[PDB]
Design a protein around this nucleic acid. Sequence first.
DNA 1: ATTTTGACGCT
DNA 2: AGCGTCAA
Length: 425
Amino acid sequence: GPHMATGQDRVVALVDMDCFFVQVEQRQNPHLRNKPCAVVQYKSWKGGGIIAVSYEARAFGVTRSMWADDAKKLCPDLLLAQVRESRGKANLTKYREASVEVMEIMSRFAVIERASIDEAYVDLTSAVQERLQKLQGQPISADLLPSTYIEGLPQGQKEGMRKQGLFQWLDSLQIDNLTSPDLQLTVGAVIVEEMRAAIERETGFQCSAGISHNKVLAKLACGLNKPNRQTLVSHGSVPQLFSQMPIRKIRSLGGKLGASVIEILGIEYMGELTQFTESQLQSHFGEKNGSWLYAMCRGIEHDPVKPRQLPKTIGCSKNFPGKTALATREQVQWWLLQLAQELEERLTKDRNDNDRVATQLVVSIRVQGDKRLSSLRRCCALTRYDAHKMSHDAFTVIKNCNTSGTEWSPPLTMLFLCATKFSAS
DNA sequence: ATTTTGACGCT
DNA sequence: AGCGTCAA
Ligand SMILES: Nc1ncnc2c1ncn2[C@H]1C[C@H](O)[C@@H](COP(=O)(O)NP(=O)(O)OP(=O)(O)O)O1
Ligand SMILES: [Mg+2]
Ligand SMILES: [Mg+2]
């Protein structure tokens, strides 16, 4: 009762851009706007591989990882934008720069955690407290929440349903209580409406958001009403929401760990986890995972929003599948140089922008026939931002993988260079 | 022969 | 450190 934590101490939002790379391309090229569209990498093999899909194209069944040639079978009028190629490889600079546009806007509202190229968490707890003081007990008009869904409501047209749910929620709020978690989430949603309006006004890009008490629930909430909408998941909404929620839908449970939860416990839904003691869950999944699951299935998580707006690593990667695998020393050295030149360009820009220098170079390769994605991943010192030195050092680190008694055997099917371990500069 | 990323955990 | 998991 009075000593049972409820995980309602923070207001956390997760903002995630809608079909992000597509919107970047649609801003640049108005002919792509409001069309079935996808972003592809490469072209010669099966029309290229799709990495982002507009909602209009998703209605035809087009998905990420599809070859463009097959997507065209589902959607004959599908429009395509190609990722830039530089030095023989896909180059993601346009999307990294568009991401910075969005992150810098979000950072005006609160400190952010950059969780991917297109999404960030924000801890709105302080901002909500401030806004609740500026409010002075006044009620919250539905007009301040024009794109907000309240998960679980209404209870007892889709825009009409959205407004019915919001009306039920607001009618039940105790606006007189500055410590009420539900009121805090509501003010958080007002702030997120403002943040999302600023992103769209200042970049042209639309996004969705989740508002809840922790990162996992905010991320889950965000996807409930994509695109171009935001969703509030209250603590009270958790039992019903989790009662039919597949375990794999919760962040970190979409892979082998989640599959093992399902198999070992004989359950399907997140809510079913409440029927195990913390010790039982720790016995199956480890101390850390077990405690995390015990709290998470009750809607409780403590993972903080970390104050980090910039990536911690800067990497360059290229696969050489099938016949294109690298079988000569000239080939390996040429491609290591291509990757190192892109890396040097990005590192020099990062140093000028962000007052830091990377100090370690990680080199990773895959050899043809290896079942693992990396046959070798080894580090060396990164002492100067020079592409020829970095590529020579990478070659020195990998050269003893060549079992050729000029030739490279087995052929290399992947090269990867990554700068890590930044220090102030 | 989806690829190109990038954070964090384990030992 | 090097390897693995998870997800964008
Ligand atoms: N497997 C992959 N390989 C390469 N790039 C990928 C990728 N998955 C995503 N990206 C890139 C391209 C994506 O645009 C971007 C963000 O990924 P999301 O937020 O997971 N998906 P999006 O924003 O497109 O649609 P939604 O409205 O459902 O959020 O990351
Ligand atoms: Mg997105
Ligand atoms: Mg995303």
